[model samples]
Each structure stands twice: as structure tokens, then as C-alpha cells.
Target: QTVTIPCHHIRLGDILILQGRPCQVIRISTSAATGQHRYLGVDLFTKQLHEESSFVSNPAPSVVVQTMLGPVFKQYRVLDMQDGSIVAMTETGDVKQNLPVIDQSSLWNRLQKAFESGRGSVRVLVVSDHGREMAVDMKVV
Candidate 1:
């Protein structure tokens, strides 16, 4: 049996079982007026949104498991790019990678341009397909 924990303790990249189906935490936010925590998640196989909240002082076990193994899809907000490096923030926090530039049509170039143009926040997802993983901008959805 999977150990369950309170929703307030959920972290970025945590895998949870919701409604008997696996889901992954995508984003989390806190209510400023009420001091409550809300979580945003996506279905593991469908990529559909799932939301839950911790409004009570002692909430129930809203999380079935906190794991790194389960789904491979992850979302991040593009912060900036400079000198062949990409900086972004995930649920876990800041991430910086040495992204090489191959062409103007490359993923790195598109992300860089999106960040520099101020077209609002650029969200991207790292998805695994057939054991191979690739990064794709959410705008493509």
C-alpha cells in the first residue's frame, strides 16, 4: 500500500494517485488571503489537469505517494538564456542547463526568443515517448 501524506507537503515532481489513477504535480500556489495551499497536477497518461487544496488546518491524506519514479513529464517556466545556457524554474526550483544552439528552428532558439520578446511566461514540458525524452513548448499544445 502506498503511504499517503498531507497535500501541504507535496513538492514539485511528486507523483500522486488521484481517483485511482496516477498524476504528477505540475504547479502549486498559495492563497494570500486565507493562507491555504492549492496544488495543480496533470494526469500521468492524459496530461489533463487535476486540482486539490488544503484549506483546513488538519487536512486529510490528499497525496497517495511522493515519488520520483512514475511519470516522466515535467513542466518548467523559461526564465532566460545566455552564453549557451538555459535557466528555468520547475516545481523543485531553479534549473540551468547548457543548451546548444543548432539552428533558428531549434528548441533552444525558440525558447530564447520567447523569453526575450516578453510574450508572457513561456511554459515547456519534458515528455518521454517510447523511452526517448524531448522538450516541447506547451504552446504547441
Candidate 2:
């Protein structure tokens, strides 16, 4: 459970070495294919969806490859917004002066709505891919 093992050998709550990054397993399921197991997990500290169709039925790769990496997070207490950047405070209480605002269609409209509401309670949930940081989901409370 602690040492690194094959991905196929892991169950829920396992730490998966995904893409060489340690990812946490949150959910696991299976579907039809060449195999009978599928794995859904989070790369915390570290999308990381894995398909298991050709492994158990076949010999599988000589070694299990970590194609999935885990996700981690930094929650920002908003300092408010600017032209292209949404300014905020780091969890360490330092000012993150230039966190860029992504224009992806899903969250922008609602985020702007939350911004325009002028209630002044803006919080952002930034998810990290064990590599780069980005806000995938956010909220007011």
C-alpha cells in the first residue's frame, strides 16, 4: 500500500504513480473491453483518467506505465480582478499579483457573474496537475 506497485494491482485510496507523479486514487470502476477493470483516480499532490481494457486479458506492458498523474490544489482568497489577470492572495498570505484569467467558456460566465454581483466574496479553487496551476472550479462561499 505504501510502496510503489503495478497500477493494475492498486485499489481505491492507493497512491498511484502517474506519469511519474504520485496520484491519489479516489474512485475505481470497470467497463467492457479486453479486460474487466477500469480505474478512476485523482492525482492529488500531483485529469488523470485511466483505461484498462488490454492489460489483464493480455500480458500488459512489461511494466505498468503511469500515464495518469494526480491533481492538487491551492485555494486563493481573492484580492479582486484586473484587466487580464484575476488578482488574489496566496494561501501563504502573499499577494499573487498576476494569476492569469483563462477565457474558457464554462466557468467564465459564472465567474464573471460572481464577480459582478459585487458581494465581494470571491474565492477561486485552483487545481494543479502536479506540474502547472489552473482554476478548474470556483465558488463564492
Candidate 3:
């Protein structure tokens, strides 16, 4: 099934069914020379990257919608570190306690110690969700 949405509502991370395949929005850019909106996306099945442009003068009637992709990984800003864990917050005002997994405890402990000493404030973490791994590059803060 497919639906239509106004061009103004299109945003990054939106999924669209194009030519019977699901594509995930990777980036959105505006061309200063043409003043048109450009959407860069990656096909989930083929792993191909494609771009679609929208003209300001004659915008597309409506953007085709199929399924919206949720976050696969989350980015966070390290707030504090205690013991072997790190405290971070998401961009949406949610807090998370990042603990080390059993297999990666050594590396995770190193990261926690680094953050504890105020080495860096940003962290990028990925996790599998619902049998799909979406690409996410969430900005810290």
C-alpha cells in the first residue's frame, strides 16, 4: 500500500516505496543554484543510493509514502560516567545508561573511562531492531 504526503512534510529518515522497493532517506539537501529540494536515499534491498529532486516552481503533487523507518541506532551526549558505565542523553530529552555488553566489556570500559575523564562528549551507538538495521547518524546535542 502507498500514500501521499505534502512535500513540506518530507524529512530525513523517512522511508518511501519507490518502484516497489523500500528506500530510506539518508540526506536532504537544497540546491542553491536551482533552489530545489534534493532527497538522497538508499534502497534497502539493493543497497543502492538514489536522489530525487523537487522543483520550487512546480513541486511534486505529493510524496509517495509506504512505511516510515524508525531509529536503528541512537546518538547521545555523554553527561557523566560512574564506575564502569556512562550516562548519556538523547536528542529527544531521554536519558540512557550505557552499560558494557559481556563480549565488549573491555572496550566498553575503556570508552567509559575515556568519557569519565572528559575526553569527548559525543557517542555513536548502533543496535539491531525488528530484523532491520537502519543507518543513523544522530547529532549529539
Residue clash pairs of candidate 2: 43-70, 43-71, 44-71, 46-130
The residue-by-residue lDDT of candidate 2 on 1-141, one tens digit each, is 124344456677754544444445666665654334455555443244543321332247674353233334457876766765677787688877767654444566677678778536777876544345555456776
After TM-score superposition, the amount by which residue 60's alpha carbon in candidate 2 deviates from its true location, in angstroms, is 26
Q: Please tell me which predicted candidate would have the highest TM-score against the true structure.
A: 2
> What's the number of clashes in each of the models?
0, 4, 0
lDDT of 3 by residue, 1-141 (tens): 345545577787676543444557778777898666677777654667877765343346674422222333445666665554556666786876763222222545555455556645546453333343322222223
Task: Count backbone overlaps in model 2.
Answer: 4
**Regions of model 2 farther than 4 Å from truth:** 1-36, 39-70, 102-105
Point out the higher-scoring one by TM-score: 1 or 3: 3
Give the C-alpha miss distance for residue 107 in model 3, angstroms.
26
Tell me the lDDT of candidate 1.
0.56
Which candidate do you rate higher for TM-score, 2 or 3?
2
User: Per-residue error at 1 for model 3, in Å?
Assistant: 5.1
Q: State the C-alpha lDDT per candidate.
A: 0.56, 0.55, 0.53
lDDT score, residue 119, model 3? Answer: 48
Candidate 1 or 2, higher TM-score?
2
The reply for model 3, stretches above 4 Å from the true place, is 17-21, 55-141
Cα lDDT tens digits, model 1, 71-125, are 3456766566667555556668756464223222376767767777763567666
